[PDB]
Amino acid sequence: FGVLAKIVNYMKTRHQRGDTHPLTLDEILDETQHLDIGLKQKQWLMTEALVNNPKIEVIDGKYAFKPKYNVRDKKALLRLLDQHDQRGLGGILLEDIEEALPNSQKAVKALGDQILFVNR
Amino acid sequence: FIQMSVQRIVEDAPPIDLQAEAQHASGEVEEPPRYLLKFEQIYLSKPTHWERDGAPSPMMPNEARLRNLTYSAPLYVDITKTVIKEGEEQLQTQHQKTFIGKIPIMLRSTYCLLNGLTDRDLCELNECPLDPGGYFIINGSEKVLIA
Amino acid sequence: MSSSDRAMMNAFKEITTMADRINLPRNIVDRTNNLFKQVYEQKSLKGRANDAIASACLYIACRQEGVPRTFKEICAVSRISKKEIGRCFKLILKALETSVDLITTGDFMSRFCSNLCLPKQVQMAATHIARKAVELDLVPGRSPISVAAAAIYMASQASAEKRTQKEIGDIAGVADVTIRQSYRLIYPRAPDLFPTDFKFDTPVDKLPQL
Amino acid sequence: MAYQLYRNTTLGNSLQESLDELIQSQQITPQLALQVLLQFDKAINAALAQRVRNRVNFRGSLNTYRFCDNVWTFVLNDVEFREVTELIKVDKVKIVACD
Amino acid sequence: TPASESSGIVPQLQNIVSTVNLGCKLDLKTIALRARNAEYNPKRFAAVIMRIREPRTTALIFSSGKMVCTGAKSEEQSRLAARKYARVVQKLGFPAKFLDFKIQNMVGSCDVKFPIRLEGLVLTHQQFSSYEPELFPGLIYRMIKPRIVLLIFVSGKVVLTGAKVRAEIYEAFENIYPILKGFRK
Amino acid sequence: TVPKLYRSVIEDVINDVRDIFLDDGVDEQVLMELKTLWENKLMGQVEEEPLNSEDDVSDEEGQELFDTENVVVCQYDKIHRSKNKWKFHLKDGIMNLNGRDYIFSKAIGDAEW
Amino acid sequence: TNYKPVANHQYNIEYERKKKEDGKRARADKQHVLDMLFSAFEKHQYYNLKDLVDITKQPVVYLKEILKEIGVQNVKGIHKNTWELKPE
Amino acid sequence: LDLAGPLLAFLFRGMFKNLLKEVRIYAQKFIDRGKDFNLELAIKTRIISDGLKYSLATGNWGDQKKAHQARAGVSQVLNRLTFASTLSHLRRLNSPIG
């Protein structure tokens, strides 16, 4: 579990750092200098771990996003939010930061525009 | 009772040992620390009183009446500290001789040193020769046990 | 139905349990209980360990009764470092805004000589020796207890009840060299420091040197 | 913890060079060089704790110093190691002191 | 007419403590690495300890960029060292600055050259004077005029500290010396 | 006596890895080549920013890398300092002075800076 | 009568030990600690926070920041703040 | 016939059990810190001492907080109306009154 959590975390980290492009297991091993994990483990990770993950995205030959599938939309989630018929599913503050940029600067402007926040 | 019974209780089960928690994972510390306590003879001082200067003085039963003090003597004990520390340093022993209390004593007791004094001595002490006692003095007040 | 006082409530049991170990008069303890209560009521020093305050209250009461006990002694009955007691002490003096008194050697002549079972004549001789020495400021440095112990030593050395410095040092708690130094400071006047009402067991000329 | 640093010495390096040769001549496997070096490490540590007994006194003004990861690295100048026969004065010496 | 009936014994200032901000966050590990005459241990304290033989005061380099200068005999020398310290940190490759320099502490000392009866002194000025022979051999005088603390010893030696102005030491001493003379043994 | 001790270590280290050599299937003559090669090897400012207005109190760092210094490696027992007076308590050390090699079990020192 | 030791002996003994090392250690470990987490959680799915504190040499609040980062926590039906690695 | 010695030993036995446990509470504190042991600091001599002061003064018999009800008035102040009255007091006999 730990290694997978490490894989997810690195993938998250490198993507935030600037690498907004789909990756592979081998590419992670390589970049992390952990390639010598053993072919057996390497294989088991590739064709079972990244299979048992319930949210891992197969783009083709490259694994994609698990926590945020949406694009770098940054500001404005009004169309989704407005939908009072379903409240708007709205967005989590954590999800918003993950999306692109820190919430606060956007929020200050948003608080007088279209968004209201509850601490709950 | 003074001579043996309190001592028999001291003879009974005062030895106690205590072992520290293992506190898992600490490392390779060979096992949790352990401490044992041992006791020998119990000691009793003659009836005495400590004056506000911290100094001791003899407890005159006549003095006990006047100052309304409780007639009592210091009780002392042989104590031993004894390490089956569960370490390489097993059997390392440390000796104590510890004040445990002030025991109120019956008048004309063996420890009531006036018991040897003559009437003439007792009158010299301003004590009554026909006052055998046999009852405690507590806070300067005379106290007798009912059978 | 009283969580706020419960550390204070326990502190007075611990005050009583601290007064217990050396048979202290209750009047002293009562003022002490009153002192803490006052210190508690201020709450300005709530950011402090209760047992240190109790111990500091105790040192103060003895001085308030004109019979101080050494921190060394006060340490014997508590876990608090002499430093923290001194620190807390200062804070209480500032907290309660009250003055104190200077120590005198004679106040400890009684119990120490008692602990040595020395007769009053030696005890009283020491006190004069001490008294004369301080009036003359023969020892403008050494702690008065250190000065007192050497006087006691000198006195004991002037009687049959001689004792080794280490035993005296052991009773006073001071270093055996500190007495040895303090002795070196009082020795020049060993003969004349004695009271006029004294009976030598050893000539001042025959007083040892160290 | 074993001190790998003692391999970065003449003793350690002459071994490693001789071993590297044995690797160039392929007379040994690289894995073998590692176990022997590891054993040498364990062995040299033991020799320090056992065969070594002599002590030395030293004097010298401090020229430069550094400290990180519980290891001090100094460089002193006009230093003098003192021994009853092998007295040694030196203009400058580098001192590494592990914990 | 003199300001005091006794006057002088030049209370000489012996130590200055100052702080300054380099205006930037720094990596002390790198600093410790680069420096030829500094010490650092996060397990002991979060700052680098650097020393110079020219200033002989010692600097404290916080990760925040704040620094402390110590050992200096004068505020200028403290300023000089701190400035001298700030350059080399810059010379390590950092955007160090001389922002918000200020004096933190000054230390002085002197000898009245005569013994005094502390018993009388602690008695007469208990409100300010403080002493305990069971505590420390020196009497502690906390002046409030210019908020100065004095340390008074049986030999007559005195130390003054907590100052950010040198004149205050002279001033605090000008007030206390006559009193001391009035307490001559 | 000291060079003898060094040999003891040479014998002890070589012998104690012999079995490892075997585990690799490597011939013991190679071990002897190791030893043989080895033995042969043995022998002012007015603004908060113009900081550069104070340049140059630091000296040249290249003083510290030319092997002008003989090298010493040792654990430390105690380090002390008093403003400018330093004290050193060291143990278990390897010294290489003027190309020569030395060893010690304990070392105590003093220095000023 | 028993000698006054100017400072509590055991406290003093505590002092020789205390001066040797502090719990105030550094955070160069937004990595070494997760690796250690894989090691512990390989033995059991969930652990008590105090036990997690034992492997670590860092402030709990900082530790709290880590356990939030790769995991969640429980009362495990035992109130105790027990933490475990994220199943997802 | 019940006398002082077997009776005192019972309190002595009980307070010792109280004392043994109180010191053990320190032993728990001792393991808690793991800091060196102090025997004199754990001591609470007064507890028994003062505990005895109650039994002896009032004549009551117990921990007062719990068991004591069935043993009130064990002990009383001496009568000094006459020496014979005193001697009578010294030799009087009582019962659990059923």
From Swiss-Prot, chain C:
Similarity remark: Belongs to the TFIIB family.
GO cellular component, one term: nucleus
Residues noted as binding DNA in the record, renumbered to the chain: K46, R48, K83, K90, R142, K166, A175, T178, R180, R184
Enzyme category, top tier: transferase
Effect after changing R189E: Inhibits interaction with RNA polymerase II
EC annotation from Swiss-Prot or TrEMBL: 2.3.1.48
GO terms assigned for molecular function: acetyltransferase activity; DNA-binding transcription factor binding; histone acetyltransferase activity; nuclear thyroid hormone receptor binding; promoter-specific chromatin binding; RNA polymerase II complex binding; RNA polymerase II core promoter sequence-specific DNA binding; RNA polymerase II general transcription initiation factor activity
Residue ranges of the region described as Core promoter DNA-binding: 83-87, 143-146, 177-180
Species of provenance: Homo sapiens
Region annotation Necessary for TATA box-bound TBP complex formation: where it falls in the sequence: 138-210
Effect of R184E: Inhibits interaction with RNA polymerase II
Expression tissues: Expressed in the inner cell mass forming the embryoblast. Not detected in cells from the outer thin layer trophoblast (at protein level).
The record's account of how the chain is modified after translation: Acetylated. Autoacetylated; autoacetylation at Lys-132 stimulates transcription activation.
Annotated consequence of substituting G47Q: Decreases BREd-dependent pre-initiation complex formation
Residues with PTM N6-acetyllysine: K132
Effect of K90L: Reduces interaction with VP16
Effect of K132A: Abolishes autoacetylation, represses transcription activity, does not inhibit its association with chromatin to promoter-specific regions and decreases the association of GTF2F1 with chromatin to promoter-specific regions
Recorded catalytic activity of this chain's protein: L-lysyl-[protein] + acetyl-CoA = N(6)-acetyl-L-lysyl-[protein] + CoA + H(+)
Protein name, UniProt field: Transcription initiation factor IIB
Coiled-coil annotated spans: none
UniProtKB/Swiss-Prot annotation, chain D:
A UniProt-annotated Pfam family: TFIIA_gamma_C
Assembly, per entry: TFIIA is a heterodimer of the large unprocessed subunit 1 and a small subunit gamma. It was originally believed to be a heterotrimer of an alpha (p35), a beta (p19) and a gamma subunit (p12). Interacts with NCOA6 general coactivator. TFIIA forms a complex with TBP. Interacts with HSF1 (via transactivation domain). (Microbial infection) Interacts with SV40 Large T antigen.
A GO BP annotation: transcription by RNA polymerase II
Family in the record: Belongs to the TFIIA subunit 2 family.
Main function: TFIIA is a component of the transcription machinery of RNA polymerase II and plays an important role in transcriptional activation. TFIIA in a complex with TBP mediates transcriptional activity.
SUPFAM superfamilies per the UniProt record, alphabetical: Transcription factor IIA (TFIIA), alpha-helical domain, Transcription factor IIA (TFIIA), beta-barrel domain
Annotated compartments: Nucleus
Full protein name: Transcription initiation factor IIA subunit 2
Gene Ontology annotations for the cellular component aspect, listed alphabetically: cytosol; nucleoplasm; nucleus; transcription factor TFIIA complex; transcription factor TFIID complex
Keyword tags: Host-virus interaction, Nucleus, Transcription, Transcription regulation
InterPro entries reported in the protein's UniProt record: TFIIA_a-hlx (IPR009083), TFIIA_b-brl (IPR009088), TFIIA_gsu (IPR003194), TFIIA_gsu_C (IPR015871), TFIIA_gsu_N (IPR015872)
Protein encoded by which gene: GTF2A2
UniProtKB/Swiss-Prot annotation, chain F:
Record-level GO cellular component terms: cytosol; nucleoplasm; nucleus; transcription factor TFIIA complex; transcription factor TFIID complex; transcription preinitiation complex
Annotated keywords: Acetylation, Nucleus, Phosphoprotein, Transcription, Transcription regulation
Recorded superkingdom: Eukaryota
Localization, UniProt: Nucleus
Modified residues (Phosphoserine): S53, S58
Residue positions binding DNA: H80, R81
Any one GO MF annotation of this record: RNA polymerase II general transcription initiation factor activity
Record-linked Pfam families: TFIIA
Record PTM text: The alpha and beta subunits are postranslationally produced from the precursor form by TASP1. The cleavage promotes proteasomal degradation.
CDD domains: TFIIA_alpha_beta_like (cd07976)
GO biological process, one term: RNA polymerase II preinitiation complex assembly
Family from the record: Belongs to the TFIIA subunit 1 family.
Assembly information from the UniProt record: TFIIA is a heterodimer of the large unprocessed subunit 1 and a small subunit gamma. It was originally believed to be a heterotrimer of an alpha (p35), a beta (p19) and a gamma subunit (p12). TFIIA forms a complex with TBP.
Function summary: TFIIA is a component of the transcription machinery of RNA polymerase II and plays an important role in transcriptional activation. TFIIA in a complex with TBP mediates transcriptional activity.
Name assigned to this protein: Transcription initiation factor IIA subunit 1
Source organism per UniProt: Homo sapiens (Human)
UniProtKB/Swiss-Prot annotation, chain G:
Keywords, in A-Z order: Acetylation, DNA-binding, Nucleus, Phosphoprotein, Transcription, Transcription regulation
GO BP of this protein: positive regulation of transcription by RNA polymerase II; transcription by RNA polymerase II; transcription elongation by RNA polymerase II; transcription initiation at RNA polymerase II promoter
Binding site for DNA: G77, H79
Acetylation in keyword set: yes
GO cellular component: microtubule cytoskeleton; nucleoplasm; nucleus; transcription factor TFIIF complex
Keyword rRNA-binding recorded: no
Location within or outside the cell: Nucleus
GO molecular function term, any single one: DNA binding
Function: TFIIF is a general transcription initiation factor that binds to RNA polymerase II and helps to recruit it to the initiation complex in collaboration with TFIIB.
Family: Belongs to the TFIIF beta subunit family.
Self-association and partners: Heterodimer of an alpha and a beta subunit. Interacts with HTATSF1 and GPBP1. Interacts with URI1. Interacts with GTF2B (via N-terminus); this interaction is inhibited in presence of GTF2F1.
Protein name: General transcription factor IIF subunit 2
Organism: Homo sapiens (Human)
Phylogenetic classification of the source organism: Eukaryota, Metazoa, Chordata, Craniata, Vertebrata
Residues of the full protein shown: 151 to 238 of 249
